[PDB]
Scaffold this active site. Sequence first.
Site, PDB file in Angstrom:
ATOM      1  N   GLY A  14      43.186  38.046  47.657  1.00 12.79           N
ATOM      2  CA  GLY A  14      43.922  37.737  46.777  1.00 12.79           C
ATOM      3  C   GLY A  14      45.358  37.592  46.771  1.00 12.79           C
ATOM      4  N   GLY A  17      46.926  42.081  43.369  1.00 16.03           N
ATOM      5  CA  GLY A  17      46.902  43.838  43.503  1.00 16.03           C
ATOM      6  C   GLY A  17      47.149  44.328  42.265  1.00 16.03           C
ATOM      7  CG  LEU A  18      48.358  44.405  38.299  1.00 18.09           C
ATOM      8  CD1 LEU A  18      49.258  45.412  39.134  1.00 18.09           C
ATOM      9  CD2 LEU A  18      49.271  43.624  37.491  1.00 18.09           C
ATOM     10  CE  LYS A  34      44.656  41.378  31.927  1.00 16.83           C
ATOM     11  NZ  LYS A  34      44.698  40.549  31.252  1.00 16.83           N
ATOM     12  CG  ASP A 132      46.647  30.571  29.049  1.00 12.34           C
ATOM     13  OD1 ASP A 132      47.303  29.658  29.563  1.00 12.34           O
ATOM     14  OD2 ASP A 132      46.602  31.639  29.985  1.00 12.34           O
TER      15      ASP A 132
HETATM   16  C1  OYB Z   1      44.833  36.412  37.185  1.00 12.92           C
HETATM   17  O1  OYB Z   1      43.713  37.478  37.725  1.00 12.92           O
HETATM   18  C2  OYB Z   1      42.738  37.652  37.024  1.00 12.92           C
HETATM   19  C3  OYB Z   1      41.480  37.039  37.631  1.00 12.92           C
HETATM   20  C4  OYB Z   1      40.292  37.397  36.951  1.00 12.92           C
HETATM   21  C5  OYB Z   1      40.252  38.228  35.801  1.00 12.92           C
HETATM   22  N1  OYB Z   1      39.042  38.320  35.133  1.00 12.92           N
HETATM   23  N2  OYB Z   1      38.947  38.727  33.822  1.00 12.92           N
HETATM   24  N3  OYB Z   1      37.846  39.055  33.581  1.00 12.92           N
HETATM   25  C6  OYB Z   1      36.867  38.750  34.680  1.00 12.92           C
HETATM   26  C7  OYB Z   1      35.436  38.815  34.702  1.00 12.92           C
HETATM   27  N4  OYB Z   1      35.189  38.361  36.065  1.00 12.92           N
HETATM   28  C8  OYB Z   1      35.790  38.217  36.986  1.00 12.92           C
HETATM   29  N5  OYB Z   1      35.174  37.990  38.230  1.00 12.92           N
HETATM   30  C9  OYB Z   1      36.088  36.978  39.279  1.00 12.92           C
HETATM   31  C10 OYB Z   1      35.200  37.408  40.746  1.00 12.92           C
HETATM   32  C11 OYB Z   1      35.854  36.348  41.648  1.00 12.92           C
HETATM   33  C12 OYB Z   1      35.663  34.853  41.381  1.00 12.92           C
HETATM   34  N6  OYB Z   1      36.047  33.934  42.723  1.00 12.92           N
HETATM   35  C13 OYB Z   1      36.501  34.764  40.013  1.00 12.92           C
HETATM   36  C14 OYB Z   1      35.705  35.348  39.046  1.00 12.92           C
HETATM   37  N7  OYB Z   1      37.102  37.952  37.013  1.00 12.92           N
HETATM   38  C15 OYB Z   1      37.644  38.358  35.810  1.00 12.92           C
HETATM   39  C16 OYB Z   1      41.451  38.780  35.282  1.00 12.92           C
HETATM   40  C17 OYB Z   1      42.635  38.511  35.764  1.00 12.92           C
END
Ligand code: OYB
Length: 293
Positions: A14, A17-18, A34, A132
């Site tokens: 990634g 780291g958050l 998150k 957004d």
């Molecule tokens: C900008 O950073 C972020 C990125 C994603 C999220 N969020 N928020 N809710 C979520 C529910 N499921 C997932 N799963 C990922 C698993 C890996 C896959 N390649 C992409 C989906 N991600 C989530 C929040 C902040």
Amino acid sequence: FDLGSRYMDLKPLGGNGLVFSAVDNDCDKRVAIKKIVLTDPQSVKHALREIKIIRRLDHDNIVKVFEILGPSGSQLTDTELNSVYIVQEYMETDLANVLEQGPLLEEHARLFMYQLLRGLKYIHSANVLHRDLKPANLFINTEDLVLKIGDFGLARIMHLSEGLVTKWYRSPRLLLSPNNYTKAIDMWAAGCIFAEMLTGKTLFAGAHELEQMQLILESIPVVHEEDRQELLSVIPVYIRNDMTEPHKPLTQLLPGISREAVDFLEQILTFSPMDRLTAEEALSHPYMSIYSF
Ligand SMILES: COc1ccc(-n2nnc3cnc(N[C@H]4CC[C@H](N)CC4)nc32)cc1
């Protein structure tokens, strides 16, 4: 890694780291945690604004939120801390990734649009705007073929760090008036997403607010004289001469795509928000009425 007496095996998603992907030992399932760091009195304002929204929304096409934790890992009963964690449903992937490998089939692009418009109908009914909408914020569960709207970080009811935001899905009204946010702004973004689902490429990919308008004006026609006279007084001279010059229509940006999909998109991607279909109007359209029972 551990976070309290419930969430185990914290692994990132990634370089950020958050954002983590841990497992709940009480439920025996995977969750997406998150983290929101608190310093700026405006960072607390944005975190408080978001939590109220995400805890209020419960729909099949909206990413369900489970808990709001503190710095130690204990749940919040509902402030002025240092760090706040948010437990959401875990989703397989996101539409941004799905499009990375190429265009969706007209059957999948139509199904995801129906689910996006169904999700938008719910948030707009509760007087909440996403603010957004982009493929990265639309999460896909590939096996059940379920789209779920997520990331309500910018969401508001009813100016700083503008560089980190994508202008690719912003309506012409939002580019001229950035201070005002309406339900119609979310609809234009939904149209831009549908076009990206069918072609694989971004419909209007502009580097900045001015270049974004220049690309929109080349394909989207201005029908109202009210909007036309406003542009002559706002958009600069270099863009002003370019709109009277001949360019590619919307149907030429979607090659191989059926007229049914293009004509439905021509009713959503209108320059004026008055002519634009709402989430309810788009779902009752013959192109989307086929999915309802
Ligand atoms: C900008 O950073 C972020 C990125 C994603 C999220 N969020 N928020 N809710 C979520 C529910 N499921 C997932 N799963 C990922 C698993 C890996 C896959 N390649 C992409 C989906 N991600 C989530 C929040 C902040």
